[PDB]
Ligand binder design. Structure first.
Ligand SMILES: CC(C)[C@H](O)C(=O)O
Ligand SMILES: CC(C)[C@H](O)C(=O)O
Ligand SMILES: CC(C)[C@H](O)C(=O)O
Ligand SMILES: CC(C)[C@H](O)C(=O)O
Lengths: 275, 277, 279, 282
């Protein structure tokens, strides 16, 4: 029933559209995506799944009730200037761009019509397999039903919860960048399996399965990750020997460093944008 | 499903792995909790308390578990295996499939002990992990000298009900131990640290734990469902000049990859040690 | 309301551990100082002068300690134990319970020496630590081949009066040595360093020592009285974006956890070495 | 005992970990009845809130009700929230109130500046305590404000002494105390988790390793508190020549163990000064 549009036809638009249609919450023919470079492979992949495509951002606005801004953050101000006069009372504008504040979006759109309905979200690529992690904050003029609607839609493709907007840059450093930390870890674990004699294909499968199962255990347990760790570690055994070498390298500190670096870079980029 | 029609399972050991497998098997609906028996020298453990509430029959006598079981899981520390085999070895019958879950303990060592009692013991060596409790385990197995072809198939059916399962040659199992056997502990360490990072940057602990676990689960599922190399999936996350590539740099500067290689290696080498002694 | 009216305790050795146990036992009220005897080859020790103030009986001669005592603590350095056993082996009687506190020294080695003189020596191996002096020790023990069930129950009753005490299998004792035997030294090092940190940030040394020690005492008590994982208690300290989580990050960046694992391992390995050199 | 018969009403603005720990400690000490405590929170869905409710503490979403109920009012919210709180309930602070700020870094001066716009002589005490008040072994320091009476400081010390060590300090020491004993229990929990991992590596069951390590730390801390000897002298007494302990102390030294704990106290103290200097600019 709902009309959804994507300004930007890149990886996030594809991941969301694929997740939404796989969830059955949207029909692909009721989704429109716009792109300045109608030659990207994501544009061909979106066409393959049945999404309507166009090179005119104005056409996406006119087709859509819910409008996802899935362009790079530095492109958001240009998009808002281009379509701001075409936003109407019915529109919910959902910015997925890292760093970009609700304030900055509302300021641009309010020059055209007052009370723009804005939602800011931070999600990640695993929405493509319906296991995303999404947070959102509601704007000044977002109606109560707007937030509930967005949580219903985004919950179909993974975890979703409302947050205060000032948490979103930190979320970006944790679950926004998080999949890349995991892909790095899985490549390295597979290298370790190969060093010890496993075929690469088996090593990749087992490492990914180990990470998936541990993550699901933690999500389904009431227990602290340290207690679950204690349960793996038999006295004098193989696991506790491996945990020691992780500790000796400061493994934990590197992951803290990563979340911090991603969060700080997100803040830094938006400070550059506000100036 | 005919494999599991009237099959009885027994656990020698009532620790973390016996609970995890029993919880996995029952949640999968392949075996009924009362068709499972576990034996422990210390009934005062927390795992023994949960198994009891599950409906799993407990006993202090390993011989009772052997007589009641068709498939017999050995879920004890590797150094107890030869003392267990001496105890119940005269009770192992031709009908038994003995599944050793101990790290390092070789099929050959088990067959040598049991062949002194009856000449063709059916032995399978297995390496699994605790996420079988949520039916997302990672399991490999190797079949012994006298294991029948249906024994391997039954093993694969049973262990596939609680996660990934594949047959391997036995000489890969120590390496699998270092990767997916110990793997969940690396992940739990990583998730604790990632949550600490979220807390440092201002998130509540409960939200940080949930987001980090969901990110890891989703990334792992993406890789399992993709034909692309993990490096290509990584490249797709990292926009030029962006937050993710800045974070990946600090991981690289601390040798993040080498620590995980070190871990797989250290767990595998310890597993070889536990066998050689 | 515990008191061992028929027990005479002897210490061979009058060093730190003998004083600590005698002080703990007497402060607990379970033993009168005059029913305790200690022997030492160096009668001019600081710990010897302190035992005398408590009223403990002192003698230079280990044979007198043996003759006076029913429960005999061997509180000497590990390499001295075999010389001690040769010296008093012929004086061990049926009534004696020999409690070895020496790190590394196996029940088997003690029983082999003593059995040359009289079969069936009653031997218990103990690993305890200096905080027994304030009745907050951590003690494990393992019972020997010829120790009766009541011997272990008695020693657990005695050692529980000065702290935590539990029976373990003997093959755990070298690892316990690396954890709770050496543990108090790890804590004293940490408390000195924490106080230096407080002083760097402007606190008087005396206050910094007091606050750091109270922080460690309270946290340890919290964990002992809680069913929660130390990571959960840690999480409760750490407010988002706050002071504590910033400090935890710098501990992690230096591999703080790995150093403590290194320490337990090094103490345990050295304990195993010392014994393997003895045999 | 003398405090119990004072029949004091206590309020907490904030119903998080510190409010729970102090409420738990005060009620376990017998100085306060649980139902004489009221706590408020903008989020009533917290686990600490449910624990307070089970204890019998009164809970309300309205800070004004906590203020009106209280004689001693603890501010147990995050530092950046304190000025919003003071704006909200400043007009409700009465001459009879003692206002006790627990927030890291927040200065007496900043609190008095807000509250003085309403009544002229707000009685303010700044304290830094820690979570082991829950087992009555906290470490607490406090500094008295401009208008706190001598009886106010003495009442504060009596109250906080019921749940651990408590002493008055000059306010300029509190940021350093925060880095030492405020954050200190988290350093100890990290150390205990690691020591237990070490015990497990060397073959102990986890439960025993946790118990032994915590007992070792408790006993050592108590030894130091009851000794007039330097911690280096107590360390020397543990370490027999050539023995296991001195080998372990060497590997601690080779990793810079001492420097890491100095780094920790410094980092916590510096962050505490930043939390204030940030809010000061704002
Ligand atoms: C089986 C293995 C992975 C076990 O967890 C160990 O730590 O030895
Ligand atoms: C979503 C965000 C974290 C993206 O990965 C980036 O680096 O811009
Ligand atoms: C140390 C205290 C003030 C609190 O635990 C924090 O981390 O801010
Ligand atoms: C028994 C051991 C812990 C003692 O401290 C030593 O170093 O010999």
């Amino acid at each position: 029933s709902m009309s959804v549009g994507f300004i930007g036809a890149g990886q996030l638009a594809f991941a969301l559209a694929k997740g939404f249609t796989a969830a059955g919450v949207l029909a692909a023919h009721k989704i429109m995506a716009s792109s300045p470079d109608m030659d990207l492979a994501t544009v061909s992949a979106l066409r393959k799944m049945g999404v309507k495509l166009t090179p005119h951002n104005k056409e996406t606005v006119q087709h859509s009730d819910v409008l996802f801004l899935a362009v790079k953050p530095h492109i958001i101000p240009f998009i808002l200037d281009e379509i701001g006069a075409d936003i109407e009372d019915r529109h919910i504008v959902v910015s997925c761009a890292a760093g970009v504040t609700i304030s900055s979006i509302e300021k641009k759109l309010s020059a055209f019509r007052p009370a723009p309905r804005v939602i800011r979200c931070m999600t990640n690529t695993p929405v493509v397999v319906r296991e995303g992690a999404t947070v959102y904050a509601t704007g000044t003029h977002a109606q109560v039903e707007d937030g509930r609607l967005m949580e219903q839609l985004l919950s179909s493709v993974g975890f979703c919860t409302e947050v205060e907007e000032d948490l979103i840059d930190a979320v970006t450093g944790l679950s926004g960048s998080g999949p890349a930390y995991a892909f790095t870890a899985l490549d390295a674990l597979a290298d370790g399996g190969v060093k010890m004699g496993l075929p690469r294909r088996l090593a990749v499968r087992l490492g990914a399965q180990a990470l998936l199962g541990a993550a699901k255990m933690l999500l389904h347990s009431e227990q602290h990750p340290g207690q679950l760790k204690d349960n793996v570690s038999s006295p004098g055994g193989a696991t506790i020997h491996a945990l020691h070498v992780l500790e000796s390298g400061g493994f934990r500190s590197l992951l803290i460093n990563a979340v911090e670096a991603s969060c700080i870079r997100t803040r830094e980029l938006q400070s550059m944008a506000d100036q």
